[PDB]
């Protein structure tokens, strides 16, 4: 069919790979697979080693430092290739067998394995002013020829191709995302009831949000404005639990409701990248070199998973926030507001 080839700049170390884009399920991991073809006449005694380093880039997009490099890798697995692992008999795959049959016995294969508790390949938005290596988590597969792990990797004889790990939709969804929060003011003990609902929980990217609001304003106050906005929650977990609250698409409507009156009509929202070009700190799903992609697919995890170990976790929650008026015997136009959370997993389907 088709197999990707990268090859060394020198023209000696060539790495094959089945699928650049790799899926990940809740409790099952798609394994990477590939073979390495190199001229043994060149490799007199040097051993070819192939690794997978899940880089986390966080420092700007400028040049590196003498010793800092502002990087860390959450998982580095190295597997020997020369000789073809005589100690351990790896479970050779159908793809690996076909690849070794296409070429001769010169090539030697390799195989990795990814623990499920690892972040999906997401790169944060570089921004307009930045020009360089992007932020976020970026997978990598590199094969080098050397004699020891501690030895320097000769870049002039080093091959590197970027893979991406991306999660795909759950075919069976839950019932619905619903939440209803009321608020009682100090002036009167007649709180108003707010209800919000969505069409489904999993949304294919670009599909329209269908928020269904329902307010029963029983208090002696008026709702000035209604704000609906899907907010990207990019829970960066490096050694902390830092959280971001970048909005993606906010639609407003001055549909005021009189006191002691109800109001229920559905709104439509669509999250897209065309008008979010300048929003620095946004999370985007995957980048090979610079090709524009969609927004960050919601990285679902298995129920009860250790959610305090991963690299970057993004999730999408829509806010139904409406602003009220502080009119009365002694009050100004400025007042507070009541908002309700609603989570939904907007992320790709499976072909």
């Amino acid at each position: 069919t088709r197999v990707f080839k990268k090859a060394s700049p020198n023209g000696k170390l060539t790495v094959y790979l089945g699928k650049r884009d790799f899926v990940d399920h809740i409790d099952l991991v798609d394994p990477v697979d590939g073979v390495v073809l190199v001229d043994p006449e060149y490799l007199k005694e040097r051993r070819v080693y192939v690794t997978l380093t899940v880089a986390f880039r966080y420092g700007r997009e400028d040049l590196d430092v003498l010793g800092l490099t502002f990087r860390k890798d959450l998982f580095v697995a190295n597997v020997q290739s020369f000789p073809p692992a005589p100690e351990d008999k790896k479970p050779l795959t159908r793809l690996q067998e076909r690849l070794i049959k296409k070429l001769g016995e010169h090539a030697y294969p390799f195989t990795f394995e990814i623990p499920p508790n690892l972040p999906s390949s997401v790169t944060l938005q570089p921004g307009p002013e930045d020009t360089g290596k992007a932020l976020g988590v970026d997978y990598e597969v590199k094969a080098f020829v050397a004699e020891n792990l501690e030895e320097k990797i000769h870049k002039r004889n080093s091959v590197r191709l970027v893979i991406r790990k991306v999660q795909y939709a759950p075919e069976r969804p839950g019932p619905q995302p619903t939440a209803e929060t009321t608020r009682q003011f100090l002036m009167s003990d007649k709180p108003l009831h707010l209800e919000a609902s969505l069409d489904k929980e999993i949304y294919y990217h670009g599909e329209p949000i269908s928020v269904n609001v329902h307010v029963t304003n029983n208090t002696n106050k008026t709702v000035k404005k209604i704000k609906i906005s899907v907010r990207q929650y990019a829970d960066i977990v490096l050694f902390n639990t830092a959280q971001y609250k970048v909005p993606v698409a906010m639609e407003e409507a001055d549909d005021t409701v009189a006191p002691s009156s109800t109001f229920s009509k559905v709104y439509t929202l669509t999250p897209f990248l065309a008008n979010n070009r300048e929003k620095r700190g946004l999370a985007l799903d995957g980048k090979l070199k610079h090709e524009d992609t969609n927004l960050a697919s919601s990285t679902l995890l298995r129920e009860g998973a250790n959610r305090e170990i991963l690299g970057i976790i993004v999730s999408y929650k829509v806010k139904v926030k409406l602003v009220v008026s502080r009119g009365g015997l002694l009050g100004d136009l400025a007042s507070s507001d009541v908002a309700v959370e609603l989570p939904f997993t907007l992320m790709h389907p499976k072909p």
Epitope: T1, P208, F272, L273, R277, D292, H348
Partner: single-chain antibody
Framework: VQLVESGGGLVQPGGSLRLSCAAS????????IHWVRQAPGKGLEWVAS????????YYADSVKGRFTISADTSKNTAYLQMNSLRAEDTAVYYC?????????????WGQGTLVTVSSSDIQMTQSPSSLSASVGDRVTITCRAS??????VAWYQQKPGKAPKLLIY???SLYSGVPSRFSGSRSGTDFTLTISSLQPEDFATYYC?????????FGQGTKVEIK
């Protein structure tokens, strides 16, 4: 699930026309509405495309700086302004929809509007130019690409009058809705699909598309007749 086309007519040279196509059931933020031109008695050629999710606007060599294409998400409609029409712009325009994520050929098309005027670049090559065959004759049409695309090609069976439909994409999988007899294969830069059981309905002109680089363009064109 379908897209309509409107705005046809006859415009003198130097005129303008804001021909527009409207689609229902296709989210504009999930589908990149395309725009193609079939010359009178010649081959179809892509002219413009807008991918509303990204806010981009790609053109072609004869299209860049000539006409303007825009769309709005409110009416789910795309309006193509054919400003500064010339003699070479005389063609029929079909409004086509493709999945704006992971391009998979042109799924849905439109009726089309005929436009007439009165008072780097790569080119796929399709062979044979013409052919006449009967029922049960194994026929293969080869689309040879000058520059090797990454296994991402599509084939369209355009009957006379009606808009072309999609049968294959990436030369491997057939679109849901076509009979299983259709197939396809990749051989280097040469792309070939097989038509053996030539039914009376399947006898129509075939066209090869390569959706790899910008200025996406069709090939040369083939025809299927009865021997």
């Amino acid at each position: 699930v379908q897209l309509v086309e409107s705005g046809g007519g006859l415009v003198q040279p130097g005129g303008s026309l804001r021909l527009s196509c409207a689609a229902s059931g296709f989210n504009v933020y999930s589908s990149s509405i395309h725009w193609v031109r079939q010359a009178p008695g010649k081959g179809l050629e892509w002219v413009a495309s807008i991918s509303s999710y990204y806010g981009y606007t790609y053109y072609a060599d004869s299209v860049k700086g000539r006409f303007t294409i825009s769309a709005d998400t409110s009416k789910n409609t795309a309006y193509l302004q054919m400003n500064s029409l010339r003699a070479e712009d005389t063609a029929v325009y079909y409004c086509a929809r493709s999945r704006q994520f992971w391009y998979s050929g042109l799924d849905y098309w439109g009726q089309g509007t005929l436009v007439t005027v009165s008072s780097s670049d790569i080119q796929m090559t399709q062979s044979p130019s013409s052919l006449s065959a009967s029922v049960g004759d194994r026929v293969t049409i080869t689309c040879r690409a000058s520059q090797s695309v990454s296994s991402a090609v599509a084939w369209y069976q355009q009957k006379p009058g009606k808009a072309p439909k999609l049968l294959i994409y990436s030369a491997s999988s057939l679109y849901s809705g076509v009979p299983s007899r259709f197939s396809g294969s990749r051989s280097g830069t040469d792309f070939t699909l097989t038509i053996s059981s030539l039914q009376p309905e399947d006898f129509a002109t075939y066209y090869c598309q390569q959706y790899k680089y910008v200025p996406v363009t069709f090939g040369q064109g083939t025809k299927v007749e009865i021997k």
